[PDB]
Design a protein around this ligand. Structure first.
Ligand SMILES: Nc1cccc(Cn2c(-c3ccc(Oc4cncnc4)cc3)ccc2-c2ccccc2Cl)n1
Length: 364
């Protein structure tokens, strides 16, 4: 019953979405960041100023040491083992999955985020230390009859950082979580959830870039990133066009650089002066595509912060993109489906949209 997985996600704005999980025996409860942008199940397993709980291996009778360390600079560092894992508000199963017990970390955990580890939902290829460390979801599917698919409805928010909600439906698709058609873009390669963007428009205006620029050096769907991150050249074109469209009103370039906040007080926000952004993703059919269209309500995250930023690692469709939609990670069919979310934030003139198909007469 997917009903029981509805709203199994919580988080603070900008600090990611976590699901409750239990690890070990007896079950040690922990909040775990849902991260489609990485592939390790990595959990705090030692005291840290930002941790109010951590995984305690010695407390777990079903813990098994893999006698292998793992080091991840970017840092976090830990020791590998296995243990029984469940998601109380997920499939009614328990699996023995790999766990990176994090023993020391620098700028890994986030103060006040309220999660104690990360669930890397991406593929073995980018797992640490290497691809022999089977990711959680692979273990889950292999050990249970849970379908090789999961879907994410991230709803955002709509003194303290705003609380966000969402659902991670494991093993299938919840038709109540979206309206309209699910449109699928292929997973170009199974490492990150890599996809191809073939075109992008700001208020119907084509940036008119060689589509390779959109996926330079790659495009991924990443719940573990807050912003829509864009390659340098695409970002600059995007910002230019967004500045223009919202020319009435003038903001400090500190705002466009996404470090500064802009404020109206209150309920006065001129949404209508900010353009929609349409990302066209490659269709399942060669020369087809569909667009996902997001509002300023998504890319201006709450007083607001510009949630579009520059990337040196390709396009990252982070939370603020996914928050418009119900996103199906159809691992079984190597594709990602998008549908307008039952929870996406919109006003009485615009709405996030998934629309297709659109056609073309090499974008990777
Ligand atoms: N999608 C991405 C992208 C980059 C890294 C990661 C995971 N990660 C983090 C990390 C920590 C907290 C965090 O919290 C946020 C922040 N902003 C929004 N939402 C949640 C996000 C990421 C540190 C080191 C790694 C890492 C690196 C390599 C391999 C395996 C891992 Cl776990 N996931």
């Amino acid at each position: 019953s997917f009903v029981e997985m509805v709203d199994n996600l919580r988080g603070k704005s900008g600090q990611g979405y976590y699901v409750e999980m239990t690890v070990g025996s007896p079950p040690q409860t922990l909040n775990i960041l849902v991260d489609t942008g990485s592939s390790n199940f990595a959990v705090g397993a030692a005291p840290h100023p930002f941790l109010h709980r951590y995984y305690q291996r010695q407390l777990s009778s079903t813990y098994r040491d893999l006698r292998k360390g793992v080091y991840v600079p970017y840092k976090w560092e830990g020791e590998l083992g296995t243990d029984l894992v469940s998601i109380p508000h997920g499939p009614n199963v328990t699996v023995r999955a790999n766990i990176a017990a994090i023993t020391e970390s620098d700028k890994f955990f986030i103060n006040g985020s309220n999660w104690e580890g990360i669930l890397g939902l991406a593929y073995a290829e980018i797992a640490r230390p290497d691809d022999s460390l089977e990711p959680f979801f692979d273990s889950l599917v292999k050990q249970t009859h849970v379908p090789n698919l999961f879907s994410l409805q991230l709803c955002g928010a709509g003194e303290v950082l705003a609380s966000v909600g969402g659902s991670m439906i494991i093993g299938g698709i919840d038709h109540s979580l979206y309206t309209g058609s699910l449109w699928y873009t292929p997973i170009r390669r199974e490492w990150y959830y890599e996809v191809i963007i073939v075109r992008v428009e700001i208020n119907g205006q084509d940036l008119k870039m060689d589509c390779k620029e959109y996926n330079y050096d790659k495009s991924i769907v990443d719940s573990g990133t807050t912003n829509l991150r864009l390659p340098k050249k695409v970002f600059e074109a995007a910002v230019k066009s967004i500045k223009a469209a919202s020319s009435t009103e003038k903001f400090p370039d500190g705002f466009w650089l996404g470090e500064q906040l802009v404020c109206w007080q209150a309920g006065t926000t001129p949404w209508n002066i900010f353009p929609v952004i349409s990302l066209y993703l490659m269709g399942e059919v060669t020369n087809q595509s569909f667009r996902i269209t997001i509002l300023p309500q998504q890319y201006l995250r709450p007083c607001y912060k510009f949630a579009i930023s520059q990337s040196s690692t390709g396009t990252v469709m982070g939370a603020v993109i996914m928050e418009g939609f119900y996103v199906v990670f159809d691992r079984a069919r190597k594709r990602i489906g998008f549908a307008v979310s039952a929870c996406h934030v919109h006003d009485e003139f615009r709405t996030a949209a998934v629309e297709g198909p659109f056609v073309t007469l090499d974008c990777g």
